[PDB]
Symmetry: C2
Subunit: 150 residues, 2 copies
């Protein structure tokens, strides 16, 4: 059955093979993914400035970049897998290749904490994480992301 | 380098060596911790933690969990750390029993800070070295500083 991500992480927001070197480039591209779904500038600059406060890496090559976007009516998420891991100042010093981006509206709701909780839990699951690293099919990645349960 | 836990996780809410047979018993102990701190009725804390837990385990895997709930009347978040003497089954996603818990209670009215507090807790518990430190550190004062000054 479906988790909270099913509502907010559409198929077209699951992107793979992104081959970049800079963290900035990853956030620029995340901005393009979310664009008008809101402006790319707002998304990229918010996410990047937050990244500057402290890495959003959870360890083991995954990260949850997130931010609040004025004007957004509902939360939005995206998954990005990089072709090569990049330095991300992660707590364990390992480079990051798997990112779930989360944008939330300005007005907080209880669901926002629960959505981020679900994302952190999914990415913490060792076997799910391995599967996110290797699965070649976008439809299958999307199913895995949006149907994962503890 | 204080983090968002510093303001909501006082030393008296760092509890170690707790022996419990079950999730029910640890949630009851969390109720007493928060009642002792804030006044919120222990049974309301326990009931609300369970109300959330029934929707899905709050285990993150690797023996750690973030049980959480919302509290009517609460003006700001409350957090506590509990280390169990022995790990207990917790229906965790990886099936590993749980011995390290950071409880979080938040006001019924959400604010942007709540997500960020959760994010910080999840990140620190997700760090391998930190889990080992939390598993082994004998000094409560030190555990308290580790938790409240943790940075990625």
């Amino acid at each position: 059955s479906m988790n909270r991500l099913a509502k907010i992480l559409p198929l077209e927001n699951v992107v793979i093979g992104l081959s970049v070197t800079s963290k900035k480039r990853v956030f620029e591209q995340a901005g393009l993914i979310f664009e008008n779904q809101i402006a790319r500038s707002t998304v990229t600059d918010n996410l990047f400035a937050r990244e500057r406060l402290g890495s959003t890496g959870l360890g083991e090559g995954v990260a949850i970049p997130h931010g609040r976007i004025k004007g957004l009516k509902h939360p939005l998420a995206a998954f990005v897998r990089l072709a090569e891991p990049i330095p991300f100042e992660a707590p364990d010093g390992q480079p990051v290749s798997l990112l779930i981006f989360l944008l939330v509206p300005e007005q907080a709701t209880q669901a926002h904490l629960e959505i981020l909780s679900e994302i952190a839990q999914l990415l913490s699951d060792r076997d799910t994480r391995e599967r996110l690293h290797t699965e070649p099919d976008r439809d299958e990645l999307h199913r895995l992301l949006t149907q994962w349960q503890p």
